[PDB]
């Protein structure tokens, strides 16, 4: 039977089921005020699916010059055509290869660049912005988005949205690598999964995805969406409460020292965006510092709401297209204030 919502992550994660319901705010706002992330399912059913295909991006924009990142070793591939990324998104035999002869796991850096999404892609901009959940919070001019209303005493987000495109991580060794390393943002954000590409070539790669979700500490209800409903899983997130950010800095300064890094005692390993918390480091955070987090699997059409100041990391299970909008809720405006 159809329901307004469910509770995931041992009752700590709200999952809203109807992305456009005019009553969603009544369920959302108490979870949000407590500094929790929120998930909203079903946004893909509201969008024009033809606008969000990898082959369309290659056809329309493929002669633009871009830089790529090799997710395995952080090497930068400079000044290549964006078609060289898009044409290997789902077809493994078309992917750029490393010196060892293997196909690379690539991330497309800063594309569209800076604030240019709306100018470059006006039909995509309209389709996303008109279908964002919790629109009083997430639209540029929503009544509960303070972004356009604050003075210079507050850090204001850039004009959005921003697109995040990267291949899926594949191997047992890849389990310890991030798509996006641990970091935080001083603004709130909503991140929508608009497309998931499950390949052919090395295709039949299902078992390493299940071990990644299990070892990732997914809850048993999330482990049912995999097996029961046959939805496409895109990415595994870990999110930590803003109140636990300094305890995470203390762990990563200790581990940096154990690994012979030579950092000053006040340096900021979260701002550096250089760490991915693997199973070993997540268990040490829990056991040695008493800090737990939310393990979230983002399926096609899921919107993840990330509270301002909350440390988070992302690991793609399959090839993903994500689109994110930043906003400034009144609940979390303290995190962007420039004094005290």
Binding-site residues = 183, 185, 312
Determine if the peptide bond prior to 340 is cis (ω within 30°). no
Residues 180-239 that bind Mn ion (CB under 5 A): 185
When the beta carbons of 185 and 302 are compared against Mn ion, the nearer one is 185
Annotated binding site for Fe cation: 183, 185, 312
Question: Within a 13 Å sphere around the CA of 91, how many CA atoms are in the beta-carbon half?
Answer: 10
Beta bridge mates, 106: 70
- β-pairing, 65-70 vs 76-81, is antiparallel
Contact mark string toward ligand S9S, 54..93, x via CB under 6 A: ----------------------------------------
DSSP string, 139-163: STT-TT--GGG--TTBPPPPS--EE
Which helix (H) or strand (E) is 183 found in, with range? strand 180-183
Under the criterion CB under 5 A, does residue 244 sit at the interface with Cl ion? no
Instruction: Select the span of 3-11, 31-39, 78-86, 198-206 touching Cl ion (CB under 5 A).
Output: 31-39
DSSP string, 214-265: HHTT--HHHHHHHHTT---EEEEEEE--GGGHHHHHHHHHHHHHHTT----T
Under the criterion CB under 6 A, does residue 151 sit at the interface with ligand S9S? no
Under the criterion CB under 5 A, does residue 124 sit at the interface with Cl ion? yes
Instruction: Determine contact, residues 23/322, Cβ cutoff 8 Å.
Output: no
| Minimum distance of Cl ion from residue 326's CB (angstroms) | 16
Phi/psi of residue 65, nearest 5 degrees: -90, 130
Contact mark string toward ligand S9S, 12..41, x via CB under 6 A: x-----------------------------
Residues 293-332 that bind ligand S9S (CB under 6 A): 293-295
Residue count at the site for Cl ion (CB under 5 A)? 10
Residues 209-268 that bind ligand S9S (CB under 6 A): 217, 219, 241
Under the criterion CB under 5 A, does residue 61 sit at the interface with Cl ion? no
Cα angle, residue 257 at apex, residues 251 and 261 outer, rounded to 5°? 120
Q: Evaluate the CA torsion angle 146, 181, 114, 119 in order and state its sign.
A: negative
When the beta carbons of 185 and 217 are compared against Mn ion, the nearer one is 185
Residue count at the site for ligand S9S (CB under 6 A)? 14
Q: What is the 8-class DSSP label of residue 26? A: H
| Minimum distance of ligand S9S from residue 11's CB (angstroms) | 8
When the beta carbons of 185 and 188 are compared against Mn ion, the nearer one is 185
User: Which of 121, 196, 320, 321 is close enough to bind Cl ion by CB under 5 A?
Assistant: 121
Determine if the peptide bond prior to 161 is cis (ω within 30°). yes
Residues 131-190 that bind Mn ion (CB under 5 A): 185
| Minimum distance of Cl ion from residue 225's CB (angstroms) | 25
Phi/psi of residue 304, nearest 5 degrees: -95, 125
| Minimum distance of Cl ion from residue 151's CB (angstroms) | 21
| Residue matched to tokens 């204030």 | 337
Under the criterion CB under 5 A, does residue 92 sit at the interface with Cl ion? no
**Given the rule CB under 6 A, which residues bind ligand S9S?**
9-10, 12, 97-99, 101, 217, 219, 241, 292-295
Residues near Cl ion (CB under 5 A) are: 25, 35, 121, 123-124, 134, 136, 180-181, 242
């Amino acid at each position: 039977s159809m329901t307004s919502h469910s509770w995931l992550c041992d009752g700590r994660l709200l999952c809203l089921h109807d992305p456009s319901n005019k009553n969603n705010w009544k369920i959302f706002r108490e979870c949000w005020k407590q500094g929790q992330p929120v998930l909203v399912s079903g946004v893909h059913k509201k969008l024009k699916s033809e606008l969000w295909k990898p082959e369309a991006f290659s056809q329309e924009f493929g002669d633009q010059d871009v830089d790529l990142v090799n997710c395995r070793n952080c090497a930068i591939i400079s000044d290549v055509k964006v078609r060289d990324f898009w044409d290997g998104f789902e077809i493994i035999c078309k992917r750029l290869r490393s010196e060892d002869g293997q196909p690379m796991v690539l991330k497309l850096k800063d594309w569209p660049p800076g604030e240019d999404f709306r100018d470059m892609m006006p039909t995509r901009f309209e389709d996303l912005m008109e279908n964002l959940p919790l629109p009083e919070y997430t639209k540029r001019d929503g009544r509960l988005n303070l972004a356009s209303r604050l003075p210079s005493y507050f850090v204001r987000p850039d004009l959005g949205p921003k697109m995040y495109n990267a291949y899926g991580l594949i191997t047992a060794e890849d389990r310890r690598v991030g798509t996006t390393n641990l970091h935080l943002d001083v603004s709130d954000a909503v991140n929508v999964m608009v497309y998931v590409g499950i390949p052919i070539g090395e295709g039949a790669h299902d078992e390493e995805v299940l071990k990644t979700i299990d070892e990732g500490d997914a809850d048993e209800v999330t482990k049912e969406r995999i097996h029961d409903h046959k939805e496409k899983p895109g990415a595994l997130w870990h999110i930590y409460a803003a109140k636990d950010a300094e305890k995470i800095r203390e762990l990563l300064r200790k581990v940096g020292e154990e690994q012979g890094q030579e950092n000053p005692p006040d340096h900021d390993p979260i701002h550096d965006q250089s760490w991915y918390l693997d199973q070993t480091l997540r268990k040490r955070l829990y056991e040695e510092y008493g800090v737990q987090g939310w393990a979230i699997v983002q399926f096609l059409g899921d919107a993840v709401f990330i509270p301002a100041g909350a440390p988070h990391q992302v690991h793609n299970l399959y090839s993903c297209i994500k689109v994110a909008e930043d906003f400034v809720s009144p609940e979390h405006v303290k995190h962007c204030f420039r004094l005290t």
